[PDB]
Write a protein that binds this ligand. Structure first.
Ligand SMILES: N[C@@H](CCC(=O)N[C@@H](CS)C(=O)NCC(=O)O)C(=O)O
Ligand SMILES: N[C@@H](CCC(=O)N[C@@H](CS)C(=O)NCC(=O)O)C(=O)O
Ligand SMILES: [Mg+2]
Ligand SMILES: [Mg+2]
Lengths: 210, 210
């Protein structure tokens, strides 16, 4: 089986878990104790040299960066499970919205999740000033999404693709925060969020969040 | 021909130009006047709804995000020009180092380029403190690169790939700044920078910069 080295409470690990479940790929989770700094020790730093989770080993291949592992699973196991790709030249528009997720959505979203979800469990107060200004940026991104999702059922096409999937971990995390209002207030975004978070493969990830 | 809507002074536009020249794809530049704010006007905001450059139109396909356009060009025109992919499972490691470029390198490299190259052009001041701090961050990234490039001639394989190519615009821009020392002091990184910036396709990009 594919071996996924990370943590169930890591959003970036969650991203890969989602793909693995969509693609029905056999795998085992190898736990990395983040509090203990294992992600900064050996062997984990031999699998991800930046000292981050997740990494993965599949046969003779070792991989890191969640979106790379995700895309690798979706290609390598394409014939199994959910079809996360598109026909013909549709792949190009999946690339576009994958890169929107990486470069437009994620910087703001991740920061919001750090400030509101992770920092509190470590006893650190949320930087509300940073949250406010970061929500401005994210609202502007989601206004673009609201327009897109008025024309297309999902971001890259009228079907669920990896472009949508890569959004799941931070969108889920934000639903548990006052940033949920950014999603609720945009009616196509809201329904799209309901659609992606309601998927069975994502429910399997959520099962793993105590 | 492919229409590339952007500016040669834009690093993200340069990233696409590099792939277009490597792949020997006929294209025409459609200049977008950033100083006049055309990237925030129609029709450009119908091509890139985030009001950024570049965007591209290839026949009936419209695309934005430089790395999406770039990877589209490399796949769609794979048989032409330089081979930017790898055989077998090698694609997976290309994805890894593409994502490293997007998530590990680009944030601090882009910030250094903004502070030292773009602000001076404008009427904004170079924040020396933030430059120092951000050089610490980039230096640590490039320490990982040095280790990688000690084992592999290029980042994803022993051959030039899109993972390398996507670094060109910000690396070139930093060579014209004192951040050049971060590359000069790391010998495998230095030779790799020499190897990629010395390519004919990159020279064709630089030829467009007055
Ligand atoms: N861009 C990477 C980021 C991975 C990442 O930041 N993971 C977090 C856990 S969610 C981590 O390991 N943080 C520890 C650190 O940065 O030192 C990916 O997508 O895999
Ligand atoms: N992630 C995007 C970034 C594009 C980008 O930021 N372009 C700059 C010029 S290099 C821009 O258009 N700036 C105007 C703005 O952000 O308002 C890409 O790779 O294409
Ligand atoms: Mg509607
Ligand atoms: Mg050596």
């Amino acid at each position: 089986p594919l071996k996924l080295h990370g943590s169930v409470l890591s959003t970036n690990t969650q991203r890969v878990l989602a793909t693995l479940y969509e693609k029905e790929v056999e795998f085992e989770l190898v736990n990395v104790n983040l509090g203990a700094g294992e992600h900064k020790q050996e062997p984990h730093i031999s699998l991800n040299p930046f000292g981050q989770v997740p990494a993965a080993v599949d046969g003779d291949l070792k991989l890191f960066e969640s979106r790379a592992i995700s895309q690798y699973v979706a290609h390598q196991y394409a014939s199994k499970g959910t079809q996360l790709g598109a026909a013909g030249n549709g792949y190009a528009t999946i690339l576009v919205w994958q890169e929107v997720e990486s470069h437009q959505f994620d910087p703001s979203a991740s920061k919001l999740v750090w400030e509101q979800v992770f920092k509190p469990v470590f006893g650190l107060p949320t930087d509300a000033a940073l949250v406010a200004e970061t929500e401005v940026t994210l609202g502007k991104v989601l206004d673009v999404y609201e327009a897109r999702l008025s024309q297309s059922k999902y971001l890259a096409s009228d079907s669920f693709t990896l472009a949508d999937l890569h959004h799941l971990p931070n969108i889920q995390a934000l639903l548990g925060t006052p940033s949920k209002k950014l999603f609720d207030s945009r009616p196509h975004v809201s329904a799209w969020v309901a659609s992606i978070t309601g998927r069975p493969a994502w429910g399997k990830v959520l099962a793993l969040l105590p």
